[PDB]
């Protein structure tokens, strides 16, 4: 029989990934329409407001980072006196220190499947000057981004359709996609929109009991902190609760901390789950704890590079061997992403002026983002039926829309979720690509969308004008 | 509710990847020993002859490729004039026109999930040049090396414990591992050692019905050409029989051509299954075909970079909609991987100063390799109890060991496969790491081990003197 949709793996069919799905494919059809037919569209550019891809938009690559990477890439450059004029001194000094920790100066070879050892040591030292607690090179696994590390873990832990993971609703849908792909149950817990997207451990507990009664064995809890799509930053005190909760529930803690250097609210600061766990005084029975961090986000932003890592603690060898086994299949992650992870974790120290150029780009880039983060909040809040929460961190705003019934029905007719119907019509009127609430998951009855915070600071008012024009015409058909 | 090997995914436990298996693990352990206590070992270096990792050993990276990547890595460099002095005009042109197929000129941005469009265009042209049949940008998926593309077709086609895949024996363990990880059935078909590792489609037809009779539904056929570990190169005539056999039988054809540029026999050249398929005239549905190419291999690699791609043809959209979904998720392959992949298919072609440095450079390494393949084969044959076939292509030799029966017994008592007992014993005396046949799979009753062809030219004689003093000591102990 011919290979067809009817005879593919069910886990691939139930899998859905909205960030790069229906709306984006529609957007690319429209992209062609204005190479081919300039002027047939009511707008000029397509604005991808759908993906946290800072450099896609204006963001400038940090220079110290690119300098070292250009150097490690072509190491012969180091045997030439000119480079001294074009490259910073400590970038040349860092390149050389790095090449000296790869075994035969081979930047092109496969590394140990956990990552070059040096780079792992560097990262372990960055973790420890962030926590106040030591870290081990042996516990780190360098990955092609944070993504493969979530797959690795779903695959380790899900034996059955009956296996379950607690996931926030709404969630960055790599979790809901990864979990369908590995054929396991998704067990929602519900972030309180009214309480600033608050995570309450009694809600988790209740949801964990409902899933157990239903017969599902729940293996782990994912926490996204800072959150995506909701940008909440969890607080120290709430974090002790989650850790104590996993301990007596026999649950792996999956800590997604990719947005850690994206904290915009003056009031709160980032705290590692490792910092919390160590401090509570756990050394093993550590609950298993896996922490993810990536090079894609923050100020570096750096997604194409495909670099990141995760740290494990509180697993036995021979469970650790089994992890090593899954990772060793692809051999290793890409070296340039590995070097990059090390750099993000040891940036310049003030010891050198390149440090001064660095501090300027890092700041400014982060001021830009939160200046940007607030403007979109205020803009959206002024709109009929739209309410936009504070964004403590990350790079996303996630407004609620109070879609009228005439609009819910027109969506039922079009065979679309009300969210997606809105997101699609927006796109047709304005070229603005956003991701609909659905398959981020949301409280049934409520409706949202996720915009990026990353359009160019100067392009923003023009963007919220195109938008409001559409929204208010949409409201006038459908209220 | 503790986490333990008793309760992990049985798909993970069954899976086995020897290329970095138990032997690699003992070796790593022993490497640390040489640092901890310098005179304890009976040897003083640890030689990984277990993994096709050219640059790990002596091999120099290709200069043009590295020039173009650094510029792409650090683009402001294009701006200053010093570079004309350091970089060749050749590269500068190229880094520049590459930087212009990238959407925002943005090099740390996620791409489209297939990879940068322009790059797919370059690769499509390289393929046309190679076969003289046309090929589209659309049918290409840039991946972090060849490997994730193999996981991707397994994930797509395996529904079930009864779904199955025809795989050559011996086979590079990514295949047996990836079939175990997606919980399907490996259907072995044996290559025939004495006929140059010949593959007869009459014998594959036998394996196929036997499988269909055990109630397994065989969805695909993997051909590795050139082979690994067995290094053979297929004849055109044989390949044609395979294509027709596939069409007639209903199989997907998964062609792993990662070693296209590793051919050391003037007798036969390399013919891609794209060509073999077009040459029988067939565009869509002619048959489903997936073919892999990678950056890591050949004269160039380069394994650390993790670049590669697959070319699908003969699948319907919406099945292509589904491939796309799986890949979207991880978002993209690293950008320097993608760039490199275009450089490898469109290298310099007779016009720049760069060309000659480049072919001198290109030629030196193939030749070194070929020189190396002839040495090792001759070395292992001379050895009593060991036979060794020509290696027509790729990076390795696959010698049969004729183990005495007292040696089988010793291995049972140590609870290892016999060739593993050998591989370990060998490691513990000489420091040489090699992968044992059970490990790639082999005809029952026979025994083998894979050595790489890749240690620098000078080190071989010394390496095979230790090997031989060990070997013949082992053979008279077990007399
Ligand atoms: C919470 C979270 N975890 C993990 C990842 C994976 O990142 P990398 O694999 O690139 O390291 C992302 C990426 N952010 C998604 C991807 O694109 N835009 C987003 O919202 C994320 O937001
Ligand atoms: C036949 C074959 N296919 C696919 C791959 C995957 O290549 P990427 O590096 O592009 O993912 C390899 C790598 N070969 C391994 C590397 O070490 N030993 C080997 O034989 C291989 O030999």
- Let me know: does A170 contact A399? Beta carbons within 8 Å: no
CB-based contact (8 Å) between A272 and chain B? no
Q: Which residues of B261-278 are buried (b: 16+ CB within 10 A; e: fewer)?
A: bbbbeeeeebbbbbbbbb
Exposed / middle / buried, residue B422 (Cβ in 10 Å: 0-12, 13-18, 19+) = buried
3-state secondary structure of A165: strand
Answer whether B217 touches A (CB < 8 Å).
Answer: no
- What chain A residue is nearest to B69 in terms of C-alpha separation? A73
Of all ligands present, the nearest one to the C-alpha of A174 is 1
Nearest to B334 by CA among B115, B53, B123: B115
Give the residue from A11, A73, A287 with the most B CB atoms within 10 Å of its CB, the best one to mutate: A73
B47 and B85 fall within a common domain: no
- What DSSP letter does each residue of A264-328 carry, written as one string? --SS-----HHHHHHHTT-SSS---EEEEEESSSTTT--GGG--EEEEEES--TTHHHHHHHHHH
Same domain for B34 and B71: no
How far is residue B187's CA from residue B165's CA, in Å, rounded to a whole number? 6
Degrees (nearest 5) of the Cα angle A295, A300, A305? 45
- Interface list for A 59-78 with B (CB within 8 A): 61, 63, 66-67, 69-71, 73-74, 76-77
Q: Which of A47, A76, A107 delimits the end of a domain?
A: A107
> Taking Cα atoms as reference points, which of A88, A119, A128, A131 lies closest to residue A351?
A88
H helix runs in A16-88, sequence order: 22-36, 63-73, 83-86
Same-domain status, A121 and A178: yes
Cα A103 to Cα A99: distance, rounded to the nearest angstrom = 8
Name the residue among A207, A218, A212, A120 with its Cα closest to residue A163.
A218
Task: Check which CATH number belongs to the domain holding A368 and give it.
Answer: 3.90.1150.10
Cis peptide bond upstream of B38, omega within 30: no
**Are A178 and A112 contained in the same domain?**
yes
**Plot region of B298 (φ>0 → left; ψ -120 to 50 → alpha; else → beta):** left
Q: Lay out the sheet containing A308-313: strands in order across.
A: A140-143, A308-313, A289-294, A252-256, A217-224, A163-169, A185-190
Is the Cβ pair B335, A304 closer than 8 Å?
A: yes
Query: What torsion, rounded to 10 degrees, do the Cα atoms B41, B422, B381, B264 define?
Result: -80
CATH number for the domain including B73?
A: 1.10.287.1970
Contacts of B328 in chain A (CB under 8 A): 17, 19-21
The Cα–Cα gap between B24 and B434 comes to 9
Do B137 and B168 belong to one domain? yes
Tokens of A176: 């809901």
Same structural domain, B183 and B73: no
Residues B5, A318: C-beta atoms closer than 8 Å: yes
Query: How many other β-carbons are positioned within 10 Å of the β-carbon of residue B356?
Result: 12
Query: Is there a single domain that holds both residue B290 and residue B336?
Result: yes
Angle made by CA atoms B28, B30, B36, in degrees to the nearest 5: 115
- For residues B434 and B226, what is the distance between their CA atoms, to the nearest angstrom? 20
CB contact under 8 A, A73 and B73: yes
Closest CA to A53 of B339, B122, B102, B95: B102
Q: How many residues does chain A have?
A: 479
Nearest CA to A307 out of A274, A342, A331 is that of: A342
Q: Using alpha carbons only, how large is chain A's radius of gyration in Å?
A: 23
The 8-class DSSP code of residue A360 comes to H
Residue A108 contacts residue B305 (beta carbons within 8 Å): yes
Residue A78 burial (CB count, 10 A): 14
Distance between CA atoms of residues B399 and B417, nearest Å? 16
Residues B84, B132: one domain? Answer: no
* Angle, helix A201-213 to helix A236-249, in steps of 10 degrees: 20
B116 with B76, same domain? no
How many domains is chain A partitioned into structurally? 3
The residue out of B72, B91, B107 marking a domain boundary is: B107
Contacts of B107 (CB under 8 A, 6+ apart): A55, A61, A304, B72, B73, B75, B99, B335
Residues A147 and A174 in one domain: yes
Asked if B449 and B422 count as a contact pair (C-beta separation under 8 A), the reply is yes
Give CA separation, B352 vs B46, B261, B279, B346, B349, in Å: 41, 22, 34, 13, 7
Give yes or no: residues B393 and B477 share one domain: yes
CB-CB contact of B432 with B24 (8 Å): no
* Radius of gyration of the CA atoms of chain B, in A: 23
Q: Which domain holds residue B199?
A: 108-354
CA-based nearest distance B450→chain A, Å: 18
User: In this structure, what token pair is assigned to residue B174?
Assistant: 């990514």
- List residues bridging with A187 in a β-sheet: A166
Torsion of CA B152, B158, B160, B166, to 10 degrees: -130
> Ligand 2: residues whose CB is within 6 Å?
B 19, 51-52, 145-147, 172, 174, 224, 228, 256, 258, 294, 296, 303, 308
Cβ(A148)–Cβ(B330) under 8 Å? yes
Q: Is the beta carbon of A18 within 6 A of some atom in ligand 1?
A: no
In sequence order, what are the residues at sequence separation of 6 or more whose Cβ sits closer than 8 angstroms to the Cβ of residue A321?
none
Q: Which residue in A has a C-alpha nearest to residue B79's C-alpha?
A: A86
Contacts of A181 in chain B (CB under 8 A): 155, 326
Taking CB atoms and an 8 Å limit, are A181 and B155 in contact across chains? yes
SS3 A387: strand
CA neighbor of B264 nearest in space, from B371, B179, B340: B371
Q: Which long-range contacts (CB under 8 A, 24 or more apart) does B379-387 make?
A: B379/B460, B379/B464, B379/B467, B380/B451, B383/B468, B383/B471, B383/B472, B384/B472, B384/B475, B385/B471, B385/B475, B386/B471
A108 contacts on B by Cβ (under 8 Å): 55, 61, 301-305
Calpha distance A220→A218 (Å, rounded) = 6
H or E element that contains A424: helix A418-430
- Which helix (DSSP H) or strand (DSSP E) does residue A131 occupy? helix A117-131
- For B293, list phi and psi in degrees, rounded to 5: -135, 145
Domain end call among A92, A107, A122: A107
Tell me the C-alpha distance between B394 and B156, whole Å.
Answer: 29
- Integer Cα distance of A384 and A401 in angstroms: 8
- Chain B CB contacts of A67 below 8 Å: 74
DSSP letter, residue A76: G
Cβ atoms within 10 Å of B196's Cβ, excluding its own: 16
Task: Reply yes or no: is the peptide bond before residue A426 cis, omega within 30 of 0.
Answer: no
Cα distances (angstroms) measured from residue B361 to each of A215, A374, A468, A472, B130: 63, 56, 60, 65, 21
Q: From the CA of A362, how many Å to the nearest CA of chain B?
A: 16
Provide the β-strand partners of residue B393.
Answer: B263
Contacts A302 to B, Cβ<8 Å: 108
CB-based contact, B13 to chain A, within 8 Å: yes
Ligand 2 atom nearest the C-alpha of B303 is: 9
Q: How far is CA A232 from CA A199, A228, A381, A396, A463, in A?
A: 10, 8, 18, 10, 25
| Distance of alpha carbon A361 from alpha carbon A67, whole angstroms | 14
Tokens standing for residue B203: 């014998």
Q: Does residue A302 have a cis bond before it (omega within 30 degrees)?
A: yes
Looking at the partner chain, which of B28, B319, B329 has a beta carbon nearest the beta carbon of A5?
Answer: B319
- A residues 99-128 closer than 8 Å to B (CB): 103-104, 106-113
Q: Which of B61, B82, B148 sits opposite A82 (nearest CB)?
A: B82
- The angstrom resolution of this structure is 2.7
CA dist list (Å): B188 to B218, B223, B254: 11, 12, 15
Q: Which atom of ligand 1 is nearest to the CA of A150?
A: 4
Distance, in Å, from the CA atom of A431 to the CA atom of A234, rounded to the nearest integer, reads 34
Quick one: CA dihedral A222, A225, A230, A232, positive or negative? positive
Residue in B3, B26, B161, B338 to test binding to A, most A beta-carbons within 10 Å: B3
Four-residue CA torsion sign, A251, A253, A254, A259: positive
A295 & A412 share domain: no
Query: Which residues are bridge partners to B294 per DSSP?
Result: B308
Of residues B65, B250, B336, the one with CA closest to residue A334:
B336
Token code pair at residue A242: 């989650």
Tell me the chain B residues in contact with residue A56 when contact means C-beta distances shorter than 8 Å. Answer: 103-104, 106, 109-110
Q: Which of B55, B141, B147 to mutate to test the pocket of ligand 2 (most atoms within 8 A of CB)?
A: B147
């Amino acid at each position: 029989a011919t290979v067809a949709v009817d005879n593919l793996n069910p886990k691939v069919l139930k899998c859905e990934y909205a960030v790069r799905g229906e709306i984006v494919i529609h957007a690319q059809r429209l992209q062609e329409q204005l190479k081919t037919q300039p002027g047939s569209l009511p707008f000029d550019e397509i604005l991808y407001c759908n993906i946290g891809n800072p450099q896609s938009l204006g963001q400038q690559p940090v220079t110290f980072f690119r300098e070292v990477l250009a150097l490690c890439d072509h190491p012969d450059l180091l045997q030439r006196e000119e480079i001294k004029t074009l490259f910073s001194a400590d970038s040349i000094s860092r390149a050389k220190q790095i090449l000296a920790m790869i075994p035969g100066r081979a930047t092109g070879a496969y590394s140990h499947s956990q990552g070059i050892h040096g780079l792992r040591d560097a990262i372990a030292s960055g973790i420890a000057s962030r926590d106040g607690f030591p870290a081990n090179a042996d516990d780190i696994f360098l990955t092609d981004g944070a993504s493969p590390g979530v797959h690795l873990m779903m695959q380790l832990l899900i034996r059955n359709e009956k296996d379950g993971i607690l996931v926030p609703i709404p969630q960055y849908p790599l979790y809901s996609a990864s979990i369908a792909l590995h054929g396991g149950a998704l067990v929602p817990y519900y972030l309180n929109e009214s309480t600033g997207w608050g995570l309450e451990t009694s809600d988790v507990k209740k949801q964990l009991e409902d899933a157990r009664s239903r017969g599902i064995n729940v293996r782990a809890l994912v926490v996204i902190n800072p959150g995506n799509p909701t940008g909440q930053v969890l607080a120290e005190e709430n974090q002790y609760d989650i850790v104590k909760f996993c301990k007596n529930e026999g649950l792996v803690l999956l800590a997604d901390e990719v947005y850690q250097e994206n904290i915009y609210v003056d009031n709160k600061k980032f705290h590692s789950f490792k910092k919390i766990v160590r401090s509570l005084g756990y050394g093993e029975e550590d609950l298993p704890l896996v922490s993810y961090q990536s090079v894609s986000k923050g100020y570096y932003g750096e997604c194409g590079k495909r670099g990141g890592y995760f740290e494990i603690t509180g697993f036995s060898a021979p469970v650790r061997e089994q992890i090593y086994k899954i990772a060793s299949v692809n051999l290793c992650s890409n070296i340039t992403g590995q070097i990059l992870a090390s750099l993000v974790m040891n940036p310049p120290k003030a010891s050198d002026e390149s440090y001064a150029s660095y501090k300027a780009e890092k700041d400014g880039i982060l001021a830009s983002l939160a200046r940007r983060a607030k403007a979109l909040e205020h803009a959206f809040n002024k709109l009929e039926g739209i309410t936009c929460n504070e964004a403590e961190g990350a790079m996303y705003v996630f407004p609620q829309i109070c879609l009228p019934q005439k609009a819910i029905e027109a969506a039922k007719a079009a065979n679309k979720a009300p969210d997606a119907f809105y997101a699609l019509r927006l796109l047709e009127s304005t070229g603005i690509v956003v991701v609909p609430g659905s398959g981020f998951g949301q409280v049934p009855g409520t409706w949202h969308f996720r915009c990026t915070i990353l359009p160019q600071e100067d392009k923003i008012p023009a963007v919220i004008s195109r938008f409001t024009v559409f929204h208010e015409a949409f409201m006038s058909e459908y209220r």
